[PDB]
């Protein structure tokens, strides 16, 4: 499949944020799935360039995808 992602760094989330984030401040996102991680997650990159770990299961989270996907 991959060429040789074995040397690629692996990024995982260990806890999730508890405060919802404004759509006006989210710049991007990415899904965390590597089986090397304790669990699935979403990493939101903010307008002030901060990266936050969020629960895939939360509505605010999912709706934030919708808006970034241009809804």
20 token code pair: 């919802």
Domain count, the chain: 1
CA separation for the pair 42, 53 (Å, rounded):
6
Q: Give the CATH number of the domain where residue 4 resides.
A: 2.40.50.40
Phi, psi (deg, nearest 5) at residue 51: -105, 125
Distance CA 5, CA 14 (A): 22
- Buried residues in 43-65 as b, exposed as e (16+ CB within 10 A): bbeeeeeeebbbbbeeeebeebe
Tokens representing residue 29 in the block: 């996102």
The experimental method, as deposited, was: X-ray
Domain that holds residue 57: 1-71
In order, the DSSP letters of 14-56 are SS---S---GGGEEEEEEE--TTSSS-EEEEEETTS-EEEE-T
């Amino acid at each position: 499949m991959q060429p040789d992602a074995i040397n690629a760094p692996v990024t995982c989330c260990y806890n999730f944020t508890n405060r919802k984030i404004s759509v006006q401040r989210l710049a991007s996102y990415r899904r965390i799935t590597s089986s090397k991680c304790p669990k699935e997650a979403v990493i939101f990159k903010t307008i002030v360039a901060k990266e936050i770990c969020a629960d895939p299961k939360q509505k605010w989270v999912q709706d934030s995808m919708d808006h970034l996907d241009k809804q």
